[model samples]
Target: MAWKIRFYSGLNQGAEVSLGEGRVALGSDPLQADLVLLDEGIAAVHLVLEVDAQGVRLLEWAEGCEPRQDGQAQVAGAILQALAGQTCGPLRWTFCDPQRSFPERFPEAEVQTAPVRRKS
Candidate 1:
């Protein structure tokens, strides 16, 4: 609940997937999705994950597949929290920052680029 998206599948499996305070896209297309999922059920631009006070919220940008939460199917505009776990098609994930306490740490990079400076 510390505002992080942890991956359970794909190359990012078992790792804390990076994110920002802004929007995150997940899909099969690397061009659009911030995190690319090559699974069969994932669409070209599958879904969007955004952080909020309630937790991470889902917005189904593409409707070909449904993102399930702990085996319970989730729809667009719903809050898909990290309760039991969540999965978008074949990949799985949850929300929780993996950091312990980095008091001596410094900012490494920008979380996400601004609108006019976004990458293609």
Candidate 2:
């Protein structure tokens, strides 16, 4: 399975992209962006969403790792670490869902469950 990115706010609200299994570079700059954020608060290369055989992970750019979640307090560096292998949602910048599609935000992208294959 792969991870995806959905917008909670900004110009492209309600838009999403299937990040697949790899490093997704996020930032304000469009040229180097796999995920582009236009907000000034977000850096040129703000964060990285990595999906691999092991699991999905969000990595900070260190110097630019001060983005707020849900428009409240600045997220702790430790909290970002905990986000690994979890369903994060309703946050300030972005939301995460383990399901292939989000009904509320992305009904169109919903995945239909497949029936189990078994011996008759």
Candidate 3:
């Protein structure tokens, strides 16, 4: 996917904060951000993913990378790497899963199966 210019922010000490006045939508590409602010010259980097379906995936960043989309943590690492340097605000990737129209087609799996009884 391509990136887009959203916002900016500031970082001091070991705290990472967003620059925007309000929360940024996850739909926008934070990677395409214009600027990025780091907290106290990051000795190490990590990611905090907020997936719509799975919820937040925090601190999965490793060696400058973005957060993983497939739960492998690869995409999360890439995001961190891409955020090194520059002063930008909180960036996010909003994921959404709408309710399915057909319940039969997308049925929930049963955790336990019923045992078959033998005739006495």
Candidate 4:
């Protein structure tokens, strides 16, 4: 229902795959989502944001554009932004049934997932 920002920061923080406020960070903590800006580095950048009966997903594939630049020139933000903000493109976006709202669409996703197993 809401936008989720995600990014991949390598060594340099100022230049990485960032969007949704353009704050490049490492690991899973989403950074504003809605637009993986990639800080200001890397290249061949490609982002994939998929929303289906499950929930939202983020995937980056920018590694061929060469001489990675200092901005997001790919699909990650295009995908998430499209879904989060009602934009349109060639990417696929869905939450639950193919004919429902975000609420009804993502009911079975994170809201109802099984409890995480405890660290035994």
Highest TM-score, which number? 1
lDDT of 2 by residue, 17-107 (tens): 7656777777777887788766546667766666665554556553734443332333333333212222222223343445755435422
TM-score of 4: 0.23
Which runs of model 3 end up more than 4 angstroms from their true locations?
1-35, 43-45, 48-50, 64-120
Which window of ten consecutive residues has the lowest lDDT sum in model 3? 100-109
- Per-candidate TM-score against the hidden true structure: 0.66, 0.54, 0.21, 0.23
Q: Cα lDDT for residue 9, model 2?
A: 54
**Which lDDT tens digits does candidate 1 get at residues 35-81?**
88766667888778787654677876666556777666777778764
Q: Regarding TM-score, does 2 or 4 come out ahead?
A: 2
33, model 3: CA deviation in Å?
Answer: 6.4
Q: Give candidate 3's whole-model lDDT.
A: 0.29
Candidate 3, residues 45-118: lDDT per residue as tens digits?
Answer: 23333322222224333344444332233433233222223221232222222321212111222235569989
Off by over 4 Å in 4: 6-38, 42-45, 58-60, 64-120
Tens-place lDDT per residue, model 4, 42-118, is 33223344544334444454344311112223345333322232211211122223333342231121223457877
Task: List CA RMSD, all candidates.
Answer: 15.5, 14.7, 15.8, 14.4
**Would you list the rank order by TM-score, best first?**
1, 2, 4, 3
Q: Tell me the spans in candidate 1 whose CA falls farther than 4 Å from its real position.
A: 98-120
lDDT of 4 at 56: 44
Q: For every model in order, what is the number of clashing pairs?
A: 0, 1, 26, 24
